[PDB]
Design a protein around this nucleic acid. Structure first.
Length: 271
RNA sequence: AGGACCGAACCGACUAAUGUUGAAAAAUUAGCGGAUGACUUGUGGCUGGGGGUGAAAGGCCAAUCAAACCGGGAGAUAGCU
RNA sequence: GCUCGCCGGAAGACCAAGGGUUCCUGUCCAACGUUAAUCGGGGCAGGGUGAGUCGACCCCUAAGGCGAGGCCGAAAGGCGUAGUCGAUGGGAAACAGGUUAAUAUUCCUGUACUUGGUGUUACUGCGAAGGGGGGACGGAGAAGGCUAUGUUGGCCGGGCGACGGUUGUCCCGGUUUAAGCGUGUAGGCUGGUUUUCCAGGCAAAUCCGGAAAAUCAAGGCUGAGGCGUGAUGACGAGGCACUACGGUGCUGAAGCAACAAAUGCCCUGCUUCCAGGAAAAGCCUCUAAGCAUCAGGUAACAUCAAAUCGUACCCCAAACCGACACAGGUGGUCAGGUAGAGAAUACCAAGGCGCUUGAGAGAACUCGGGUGAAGGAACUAGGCAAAAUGGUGCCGUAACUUCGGGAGAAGGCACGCUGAUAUGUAGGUGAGGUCCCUCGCGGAUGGAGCUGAAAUCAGUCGAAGAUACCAGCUGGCUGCAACUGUUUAUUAAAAACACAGCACUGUGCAAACACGAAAGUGGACGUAUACGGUGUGACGCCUGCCCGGUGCCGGAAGGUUAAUU
RNA sequence: AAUUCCUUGUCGGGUAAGUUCCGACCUGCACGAAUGGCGUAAUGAUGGCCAGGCUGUCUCCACCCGAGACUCAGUGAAAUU
RNA sequence: CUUUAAUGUUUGAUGUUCUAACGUUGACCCGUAAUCCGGGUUGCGGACAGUGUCUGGUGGGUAGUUUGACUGGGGCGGUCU
């Protein structure tokens, strides 16, 4: 649910929480936990590569099954859980054979609902089938891009893919970016939409709320001194040059895609 | 409940006086600010010089920073003292 | 040695890091000590550090480092797998008392415990570089139940007062005792039990997990403290003999209760919230390969072993970092009494110090302070500085507002002591007795005693009763920035930097982008409600006109146009 | 006006008297709408201004308590030349 | 030898298709008790991509440098035969 707190303190007027009591009020499944050490935006060379990464609350990694390769075995949802490593929630499923796994929680999933992956699976939210068996025009998420590697598209809070066409061994998809991409007709896709759509309405309300997420403050560049950033300085606020990143790139319209390896799966990139 | 209030430890350093061959190569004294938090602290680790880090001051990187320190090129060059 | 004064949430006590003999004793005073010095953290000499239980080493691992082959790279070398290292973390076990000039949970006395090896005996399915469990974990908050500890009383011992009074409702002191073993309570968590079956746990499995039945509700795990034992003991204020008044022998009374009570224990709990909270081993289990009248496992008993290094002393300081015996800096732990909300503050206990030049004088001037006639900011760049305000309760409290605030607005009244109410009340704690009982650390009743506010009425003293230290000046108009925050260590704390929010733009994952000759890593074990960049900077009302120029995104009819030929 | 040269702009308020301050006027030397514009409760060791109270800040200093200064003994510097 | 159509050979451009180079930060197996690496089977891409040499463009992202003299001080102006 969406909740707007009261202005009992400067730093709480504009806070907007996303509460869901259906989530588990306890510890998660331990066998599916892993250590997740924060990097601070640094690499094997110890140099900052991605700025504004640092701090944040300690997090343990929940092993999620993006493949759903256990076909022909039903599974029922036990409880919904909070996952800090992603924007969406996860679901603790129990297979008939006693195997437990985590999966992304769709829109209208609950506890006790059944799901089945494979080819003969029914067309209901939570089930997973190759897009070869998915009817055209439907909505799916956690889509594979190459058969066998696992879902890579539409994995965020309220994201979904819509199958719009099927030509041959390939199928066309409009992604949440509006891009029209085509992928092979053997990539598993979980039906439905990821359910946390009230996630975009979250308003942090204060600076610390960003530091809990592991986000360090962002310094613009206009006040930076010429040795530091092209925008540099100036007596007052001059900024009389073209917007540019550090290292000298525009950042205000210049397209920087230079892959040329796919060059086939793109149809209606955007615009 | 709170980057909430008053307020010690703790962390800070706004004013003033003293001191300025000082007790001290930046402190003392009376007051001041934060004090459950973007807080603070111990231990150990990573990032190495046109590079690092930087809630960005050209700030910090061993009392040294508009390009550290040591050694070397090297008895640099000095139409100037 | 008698007094004085100082600290006493330390200027006390025990450690780590660090230092490395500064420790104790004797001796010496040239140099060192900011003076002298018989003294010394000084010179010389000798002596001193005792561990199966503390710590390290050791087993396990985090960040991270190295890294067999290998990938990559002009050489050097870089990244990294298997692995091996790496605490600041996890992992077996000792308490009390006594004792040296200097060491002790290390020696001694007493009483204990843990992990292993060997052997005997008895009962037996043993086995891992594998599987499972467990280890294993956040913040805040609310209590309750306990202890440390303290206070009073009682008990024991001693004392009867340098000056009026003090054989009593008087005074001083003491009133101590461990781990361990045993009981398993307050209270917390969980429903147990038997059998059958199964696409899972890399193969297997009696174990984990899943399903379906049966029979039962009482089963088990965890757990401070208390009680008992430990203890016919040790300790013990004071005595009896030795006593060079430096001390050693024997003896040695009371050794209870009530109240109060922690930030500590139950509590790695409970409740709640979002930012969703290490790993591996030990340990407990499961079988497999394999070995089975073996080997091995299990219980009891016996016996042996538990090595090695560290252990002195300072450690908020004269011994560490600061060139000094330097108003500095340095992490953890123990946390007494009176008043107090309090680890503030004042005064004190234990304990430790008076800060390594003194004496006298009592001028100017300087530093730190105290008081002040009348006036009261006339001072001055400016109320700088200083003065003042200052607590608790009650009453009361404006514009404005994002309806939370503003606000402790402003302002006003009352605060001491004694007595009564009430020989000490409300409340809290709670004995004996009584009743019950699954006869227990039980339950009910019970109210003794202990402790104990606040208020009211009356009376009374003083110039003054929040009398000391401690302890908000207030209000009004206004600029800037929303706010909490961050910043030029060492002249600038700000209107700057961040900020939540808003927008533009890029990025379809081998993502953009960044560090790298490269491999590769970060981004991210993320996937457009995501990530990067840019600018703006809460919220509210709004964000206009202009695409010629620069740039960016698109388009092509034609022209120009490199290498090459 | 954190922007206004002329300029202490003019009028008014406050003051016995106001180059600052507040509020209106527009002739905006040279505001202007995300290098954002106009407002904005709250907050600020923030800048400016007016009051009450308070005072040795001052009219105008006076006395007093301590530490140095001064004398005596011991030890015994420095910049400079 | 002026002339041009079915062939052949010749190479060139474009398009379609294929797989064997190549790629795979897809899957599975072994080395192997190993998310490295390599090999192997297969799938998806596919002569594109990507790399090297050459070459045009862009290129303060990063470097090495320049930016005059006279002058009633210098700069501005003016001047330099």
């Amino acid at each position: 649910a969406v909740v707007k707190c009261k202005p009992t303190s400067p730093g709480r007027r504009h806070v907007v929480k996303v509460v869901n009591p259906e989530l588990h009020k306890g510890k998660p499944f331990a066998p599916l936990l892993e250590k997740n050490s924060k990097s601070g935006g640094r690499n094997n060379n110890g140099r900052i590569t991605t700025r504004h990464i640092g701090g944040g609350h300690k997090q343990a990694y929940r092993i999620v099954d993006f493949k759903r390769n256990k076909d022909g075995i039903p599974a029922v949802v036990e409880r919904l859980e909070y996952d800090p490593n992603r924007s969406a929630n996860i679901a603790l499923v129990l297979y008939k054979d006693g195997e437990r796994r985590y999966i992304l929680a769709p829109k209208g999933l609950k506890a006790g609902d059944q799901i089945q992956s494979g080819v003969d699976a029914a067309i209901k939210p939570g089930n997973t089938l190759p897009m070869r068996n998915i009817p055209v025009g439907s909505t799916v998420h956690n889509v594979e891009m190459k058969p066998g590697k696992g879902g890579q598209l539409a994995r965020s809070a309220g994201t979904y893919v819509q199958i719009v066409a099927r030509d041959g061994a390939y199928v066309t998809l409009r992604l949440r970016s509006g891009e029209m991409r085509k992928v092979e007709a053997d990539c598993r896709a979980t039906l439905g939409e990821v359910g946390n759509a009230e996630h975009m309405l979250r308003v942090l309300g204060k600076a610390g709320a960003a530091r809990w997420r592991g986000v360090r403050p962002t310094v613009r560049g206009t006040a930076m001194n010429p040795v530091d950033h092209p925008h540099g300085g100036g007596e007052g606020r001059n900024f009389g040059k073209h917007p540019v990143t550090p290292w000298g790139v525009q950042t205000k319209g210049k397209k920087t895609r230079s892959n040329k390896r796919t060059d086939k799966f793109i149809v209606r990139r955007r615009s």
